Amino acid sequence: QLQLQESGPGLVKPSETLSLTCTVSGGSISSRSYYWGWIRQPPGKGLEWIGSIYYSGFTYYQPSLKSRVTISVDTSKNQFSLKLSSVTAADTAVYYCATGGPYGDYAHWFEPWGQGTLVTVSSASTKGPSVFPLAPSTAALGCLVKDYFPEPVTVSWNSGALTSGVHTFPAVLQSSGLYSLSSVVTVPSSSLGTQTYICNVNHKPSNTKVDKRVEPKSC
Amino acid sequence: EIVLTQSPGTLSLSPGERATLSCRASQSVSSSYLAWYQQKPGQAPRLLIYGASSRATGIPDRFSGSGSGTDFTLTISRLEPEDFAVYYCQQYGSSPITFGQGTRLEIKRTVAAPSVFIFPPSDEQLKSGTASVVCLLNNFYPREAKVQWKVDNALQSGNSQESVTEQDSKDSTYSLSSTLTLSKADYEKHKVYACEVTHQGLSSPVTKSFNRGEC
Amino acid sequence: EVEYRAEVGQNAYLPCFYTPAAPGNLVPVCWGKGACPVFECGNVVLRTDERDVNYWTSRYWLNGDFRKGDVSLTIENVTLADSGIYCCRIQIPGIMNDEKFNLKLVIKPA
To answer: Which domain of life is it from (chain C)?
Structure first.
């Protein structure tokens, strides 16, 4: 099975150039009768095709973006790339790479897709989060991941070994212009004294990682 | 360009029922070159149907596509809770390639009251001048819920933000987090912090509280 | 109605030419069966960006000076099943629209 993986910055300043790369594994990006596309999704909005490049080099673009967009392939590295110049906040979106084929008749559906990577276009500086406990007293506990920019953060519990009863909420944008989110987990009230619960917070844009052990507050 | 208009914008149906999703095009789409995608929360879109009616490999028989000209449908029979998603159509009969704006499909379930929890601000946060108080509503249905913060019986307004998870793909419930933000100075002037929750599954509102400085 | 003809067992010739306005540097070219579609070619018969895996054994060849814009197609040892429309398509970099030629091939029995 083909697998696609986006890479590149999560934060770009207005008027600068957004560059992303898609690395293809499990198959050759030069195989006959395949095409390779970039599609983006602004937060809370629908999908917009940016452009595609065929195995044979033919490139096609969304007309409104053509003056700013370059898609290219590096067959040596099995990668294809997107450059979008002169970005503004309109270009904040999750960017996906995707592929389609092998086609007989022309087609241009996409499957599989990459995982998507969020790019925020902003002049604001990156800021890593502070992590605070949501302490218990079934029982619930959690971590409050406050005051970071840009999105996203990821949160796991016990290095991914605790997933039952976990809820990681969408972040909210505060009036300060920084994000905050919570992650919670429900556990047995009789377990609070014995068992260890650690939330693992990763904010890649600031290279900030935090491991926070959450316990009942001592009194 | 060909503009695709999906209807309805939102759909809420019980498991085992049939969902009918419409995609309508501003001009005729050449050769039934219309595809449908399922997008689950946090995931890339997944191709369901191409060429209006051909099922993608690995897609269950309960997904069907049909239509032609300007009117296309996606049909999902025998709905399952894991079918919660936003569904998108796509045309590729002309350039630019375009997509509809999506239909959000919620899968109904029986009423489930939230479990409610309140969390005081941590001492570590208080030292930097701000207090966040968090109320959690866990695993409820339907999505409509009311959180009212009270501080020594004063109803708080304008100083909270909330967010709600996507529908759980197995139990079809939602959860909600509300954060009340106060200055450390205001937090330390008051004693009783309370979250009152109203929801269809609660016969009367449920209140969870703490007293500042007590355990 | 322009049709190109070959007789069964002969080699067919489908002319296709473009202005090599990007000098020295490679230009996407495709040929396929069927009229030129929205993008690139349907039912691709040959590649020009690199040699195919079975290059030596294929019946489809570009025997002209493709460097100078001659991307005419040879179809070797034709059969009646080779009759139909063929698409020749060229994308000179930056062009607003590809140049697209639909060529009708009629094979006649021997």
So the answer is: Eukaryota
The helix/strand/coil state of B101 is: coil
Please answer yes or no on whether B50 and A146 come within 8 Å at the CB atom.
no
* Domain range A130-214, its CATH number among 2.60.40.10, 2.60.120.200, 2.40.50.150, 3.40.50.300: 2.60.40.10
Data resolution in angstroms: 1.5
Element (H, E) at B34: strand B34-39
Cβ distance B98 to A49 less than 8 Å, yes or no, reads yes
Sheet holding A18-25, edge to edge: A3-7, A18-25, A79-84, A69-74
- Determine the residue among A29, A54, A61 to mutate to test chain C binding: the one whose Cβ has the most chain C Cβ atoms within 10 Å: A54
Question: Tokens at residue B81, please?
Answer: 């809770």
Name the residue ranges covered by the structural domains of chain C.
Answer: 1-110
In single-letter form, the type of residue at position B5 comes to T
* B136 and B92 assigned to the same domain: no
- How many alpha carbons lie under 13 Å from residue A112 in its C-beta half-sphere? 17
Over its C-alpha atoms, chain C yields an Rg (Å, rounded) of 14
Mutation site, C25, C36, C44, C95, interface A, largest A CB count within 10 A: C44
CATH number, domain with residue B200: 2.60.40.10
